[PDB]
Protein backbone atom coordinates (compact mmCIF):
# COMPACT_ATOMS: atom_id res chain seq x y z
CA UNK A 1 0.00 0.00 0.00
CA UNK A 2 2.77 2.40 1.03
CA UNK A 3 6.25 2.61 -0.55
CA UNK A 4 9.16 0.68 0.98
CA UNK A 5 9.84 1.61 4.59
CA UNK A 6 6.74 3.77 5.02
CA UNK A 7 4.17 3.24 7.77
CA UNK A 8 1.29 5.24 9.22
CA UNK A 9 2.05 6.35 12.79
CA UNK A 10 0.75 8.73 15.43
CA UNK A 11 2.33 10.81 18.18
CA UNK A 12 2.39 9.57 21.76
CA UNK A 13 2.84 13.18 22.85
CA UNK A 14 -0.04 14.53 20.76
CA UNK A 15 -2.20 12.05 18.87
CA UNK A 16 -1.94 13.39 15.35
CA UNK A 17 -1.37 10.90 12.54
CA UNK A 18 1.76 11.11 10.41
CA UNK A 19 3.87 8.92 8.13
CA UNK A 20 7.25 7.48 9.07
CA UNK A 21 9.87 5.65 7.04
CA UNK A 22 11.76 3.20 9.24
CA UNK A 23 14.63 2.94 6.73
CA UNK A 24 15.30 6.65 6.16
CA UNK A 25 13.86 7.82 9.53
CA UNK A 26 11.93 10.48 7.62
CA UNK A 27 8.65 11.77 9.04
CA UNK A 28 5.97 13.83 7.28
CA UNK A 29 2.30 14.69 7.58
CA UNK A 30 1.69 13.90 3.91
CA UNK A 31 0.78 10.40 2.77
CA UNK A 32 3.89 9.26 0.85
CA UNK A 33 1.83 7.91 -2.06
CA UNK A 34 -1.57 8.61 -3.58
CA UNK A 35 7.88 -5.15 -8.65
CA UNK A 36 10.01 -2.06 -9.22
CA UNK A 37 12.68 -2.70 -6.58
CA UNK A 38 15.39 -0.12 -5.89
CA UNK A 39 17.29 2.03 -8.36
CA UNK A 40 20.59 0.43 -9.28
CA UNK A 41 22.46 3.70 -8.65
CA UNK A 42 21.62 6.93 -6.82
CA UNK A 43 23.19 10.34 -6.36
CA UNK A 44 22.93 11.93 -2.92
CA UNK A 45 24.03 14.95 -0.95
CA UNK A 46 24.39 14.82 2.80
CA UNK A 47 24.92 16.90 5.93
CA UNK A 48 27.01 15.17 8.58
CA UNK A 49 27.11 16.18 12.24
CA UNK A 50 29.93 14.40 14.06
CA UNK A 51 30.20 13.81 17.80
CA UNK A 52 32.83 12.74 20.32
CA UNK A 53 32.17 9.05 19.55
CA UNK A 54 32.51 9.43 15.77
CA UNK A 55 35.15 7.24 14.13
CA UNK A 56 37.27 10.35 13.45
CA UNK A 57 36.13 13.09 15.86
CA UNK A 58 37.50 15.91 13.70
CA UNK A 59 36.61 17.88 10.58
CA UNK A 60 37.40 21.03 8.64
CA UNK A 61 34.89 22.78 10.93
CA UNK A 62 36.94 21.95 14.05
CA UNK A 63 39.98 19.77 14.66
CA UNK A 64 38.39 18.34 17.84
CA UNK A 65 34.71 17.38 17.93
CA UNK A 66 33.55 17.30 21.55
CA UNK A 67 29.75 17.43 21.28
CA UNK A 68 27.81 14.43 22.52
CA UNK A 69 25.66 12.20 20.34
CA UNK A 70 22.56 13.82 21.85
CA UNK A 71 23.80 17.33 21.08
CA UNK A 72 24.58 16.19 17.53
CA UNK A 73 21.07 14.75 17.20
CA UNK A 74 19.57 18.00 18.48
CA UNK A 75 21.55 19.87 15.82
CA UNK A 76 20.39 17.46 13.10
CA UNK A 77 16.76 17.87 14.19
CA UNK A 78 17.19 21.64 14.12
CA UNK A 79 18.57 21.57 10.57
CA UNK A 80 15.70 19.33 9.44
CA UNK A 81 13.20 21.78 10.96
CA UNK A 82 14.82 24.76 9.24
CA UNK A 83 14.78 22.99 5.87
CA UNK A 84 11.13 21.91 6.18
CA UNK A 85 10.10 25.41 7.28
CA UNK A 86 11.73 26.99 4.24
CA UNK A 87 13.93 29.24 6.39
CA UNK A 88 17.10 27.48 5.24
CA UNK A 89 18.09 25.39 2.22
CA UNK A 90 19.73 21.96 2.37
CA UNK A 91 22.76 22.82 0.22
CA UNK A 92 23.35 26.08 2.10
CA UNK A 93 23.31 24.28 5.46
CA UNK A 94 25.56 21.46 4.26
CA UNK A 95 28.08 23.99 2.94
CA UNK A 96 28.30 25.75 6.31
CA UNK A 97 27.75 23.08 8.96
CA UNK A 98 28.51 19.61 7.56
CA UNK A 99 31.47 17.97 9.29
CA UNK A 100 32.24 16.17 6.00
CA UNK A 101 34.72 17.35 3.37
CA UNK A 102 31.87 17.11 0.85
CA UNK A 103 30.65 20.44 2.27
CA UNK A 104 32.89 22.07 -0.35
CA UNK A 105 30.62 20.39 -2.93
CA UNK A 106 27.46 21.64 -1.17
CA UNK A 107 27.17 18.19 0.40
CA UNK A 108 27.26 16.35 -2.94
CA UNK A 109 28.75 12.84 -2.83
CA UNK A 110 28.13 11.94 -6.47
CA UNK A 111 26.55 8.72 -7.64
CA UNK A 112 27.13 5.38 -5.93
CA UNK A 113 25.99 1.75 -5.99
CA UNK A 114 25.24 -0.76 -3.26
CA UNK A 115 28.25 -1.91 -1.25
CA UNK A 116 30.08 1.42 -1.50
CA UNK A 117 28.75 3.48 1.43
CA UNK A 118 28.29 2.58 5.08
CA UNK A 119 25.32 0.23 5.42
CA UNK A 120 22.91 2.59 7.28
CA UNK A 121 23.76 5.39 4.85
CA UNK A 122 23.28 3.02 1.90
CA UNK A 123 19.97 1.61 3.17
CA UNK A 124 18.51 5.09 3.64
CA UNK A 125 19.85 6.41 0.32
CA UNK A 126 18.33 3.66 -1.82
CA UNK A 127 15.00 3.93 0.03
CA UNK A 128 14.64 7.63 -0.82
CA UNK A 129 12.80 8.63 -3.95
CA UNK A 130 14.29 11.34 -6.14
CA UNK A 131 14.13 14.67 -4.32
CA UNK A 132 13.34 13.17 -0.90
CA UNK A 133 15.20 13.93 2.32
CA UNK A 134 15.97 11.45 5.09
CA UNK A 135 15.57 11.88 8.81
CA UNK A 136 18.53 11.35 11.14
CA UNK A 137 20.67 8.48 9.86
CA UNK A 138 23.20 7.03 12.31
CA UNK A 139 26.56 5.72 11.06
CA UNK A 140 30.01 5.24 12.57
CA UNK A 141 30.91 8.69 11.21
CA UNK A 142 28.08 10.52 12.97
CA UNK A 143 24.50 11.54 12.21
CA UNK A 144 23.50 12.34 8.62
CA UNK A 145 20.73 14.08 6.74
CA UNK A 146 20.58 12.65 3.21
CA UNK A 147 19.05 14.25 0.11
CA UNK A 148 18.61 12.07 -2.98
CA UNK A 149 19.22 14.21 -6.06
CA UNK A 150 19.25 11.54 -8.81
Amino acid sequence: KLPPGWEKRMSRSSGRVYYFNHITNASQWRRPSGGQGEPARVRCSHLLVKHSQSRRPSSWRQEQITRTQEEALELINGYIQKIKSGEEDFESLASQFSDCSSAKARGDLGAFSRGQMQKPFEDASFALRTGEMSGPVFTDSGIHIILRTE
Partner: peptide
Protein backbone atom coordinates in the same frame (compact mmCIF):
# COMPACT_ATOMS: atom_id res chain seq x y z
CA UNK B 1 33.65 10.44 5.48
CA UNK B 2 31.49 7.60 4.83
CA UNK B 3 32.19 4.98 2.19
CA UNK B 4 32.04 1.47 3.49
Amino acid sequence: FXWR
